[PDB]
From a paper:
Elp3 acts as the catalytic subunit, but the loss of any of the six subunits results in hypo-modified U34 tRNAs in yeast, indicating that the complete integrity of the complex is important for its function. The enzymatically active Elp3 subunit of Elongator contains two functional domains, utilizes multiple cofactors, and conducts a unique uridine base modification specifically found only at the wobble base position of tRNAs. The two domains form a cleft that contains several highly conserved basic residues, which bind and accommodate the tRNA anticodon stem loop (ASL). The current model of a radical based Elp3-mediated cm5-modification reaction is proposed as follows (i) Elp3 recruits SAM and cleaves it to generate a 5’deoxyadenosine radical (5’-dA) in the rSAM domain, (ii) Elp3 hydrolyzes acetyl-CoA in the KAT domain and (iii) an acetyl radical is formed by the products of the two domains and (iv) is transferred onto the C5 position of U34 in the bound tRNA molecule.
We used full length and truncated versions of purified MinElp3 in crystallization trials and obtained well-diffracting crystals for monomeric MinElp3Δ1–19, MinElp3Δ1–46, and MinElp3Δ1–54. We solved their structures using a poly-alanine model of DmcElp3 via molecular replacement at 1.9 Å, 1.9 Å, and 2.1 Å resolution, respectively. Although all three versions contained various lengths of the N-terminus and also showed no signs of degradation, we could observe interpretable electron density only starting from residue V72 in all collected and refined datasets. The overall structure and domain arrangement and interface between the rSAM and KAT domains of MinElp3 are almost identical to DmcElp3. The main difference relates to the Fe–S cluster loop region (aa 87–123) and the Fe–S cluster itself, which were both completely unstructured in all monomeric MinElp3s. We previously identified a Zn-binding motif in the central linker region between the two domains that is coordinated by three cysteine residues, which are strictly conserved in bacterial and archaeal but missing in eukaryotic Elp3s. In our MinElp3 structures, we could not locate any bound Zn-ions and instead observed the formation of a disulfide bond between C384 and C389. Nevertheless, the equivalent sequence still obtains an almost identical conformation, indicating that zinc might simply contribute structural integrity in anaerobic bacteria. In addition, we observed that the acetyl-CoA blocking loop (aa 466–486) is positioned outside of the acetyl-CoA binding pocket, interacting with the last visible residues of the N-terminus and also contacting a neighboring symmetry mate. Using our DmcElp3-DCA structure as a reference model, we are able to show that acetyl-CoA would also fit seamlessly into the active site of MinElp3, indicating an almost identical ligand coordination and active site organization.
Residue numbers in the entry: 72 to 87, 123 to 534
Write the structure that this text describes.
Amino acid sequence: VRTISGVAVVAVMTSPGLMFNFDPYLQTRARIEQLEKVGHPTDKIELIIMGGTFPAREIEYQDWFIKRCLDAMNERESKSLEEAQKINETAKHRCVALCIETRPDYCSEKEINQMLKLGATRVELGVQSIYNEILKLCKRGHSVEDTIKATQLLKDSGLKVSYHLMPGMPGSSIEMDKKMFKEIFTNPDFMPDMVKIYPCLVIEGTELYEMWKRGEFKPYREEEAIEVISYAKSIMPKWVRTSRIQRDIPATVIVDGVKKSNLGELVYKYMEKKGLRCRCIRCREVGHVYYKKGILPDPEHIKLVREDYEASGGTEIFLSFEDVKNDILIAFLRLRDPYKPFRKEIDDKTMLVRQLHVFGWEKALTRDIKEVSWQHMGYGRMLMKEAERIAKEEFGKKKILVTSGIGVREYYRKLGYKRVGAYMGKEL
């Protein structure tokens, strides 16, 4: 069987899910209830806004949609978005993360301002491909230049950046896809924090369906998808987090393409056969290593580790606590020296804490030591202390701004941070 995490994922659908006529409150509440039915904790919630067009909707609609999702978490009505957010800072169901999915050409400064106002902590760009040939071929409404610019504006606003990517699009190839993944992790224009990967599928009613019928598009089968994703994972940097390889599309709607439901497991077994190692965040995090391999961090070998890389014109500092003998990731912090910020509260003497993650409670149903956690052991506070030290003593910055989930602001207050516009900030 699978694993129970301490963070509840609540994914909701915006208007043009079907059962609740896209009501934000009913979707959020129904998902929480459903999770409580099966004994999954719901005190910490990652809210995911699905649709990819949300940032293009009227602001009135966005504010209301997020307000009502928070109302369902707060279990009470609110007069406005801002009040629902204030209430949620101390509610029983805290919004610790808010991910908004969007097309890369709907990611202007104005839209980023609005997303920060909503409390967003992560933005998933519908990149699909980094090659303009492929994008025009499939009549996508964005360029690779859109993706690059959006990525930079997001990073320099302190937000986590996720790329949705599709191997096997029309016009592509196995080698071309492999090159795309190498470029995404070694070209500073890209360097995303997360990637969501799934091979391109043929679903009736899409342009891809039209191309497929014309004989223009033969989608990847399992073998091809496995080869590309296995390569991608073998080269993923330690600072990249991947999504569980899966899809919420039932096999009876897939005209052509990968139908089987265990693509992630197939990739894993292929990587074993070929001796391909995976060092990315999902592969090494405590809960996954315990579920997969039955072992726990060896405290004699837990160290603070640091890895730097150039991204979108600036410097990313990836700090982690890690069992370096067994290569197990316990916690990490993303610190950025920004490049060309535009937000009012970001100086040229400002460092950005874009993310702090301590892997916490986790009920591994398939192991005999069931519950395991690593919060309240000091790793988060030690990562923050190191981040402040690096910011002040190495980069000569004078203030540090934290991108904080609504429901996480209380944590940063305990560490001396105060609200600074959309962020939690501290003078160094």
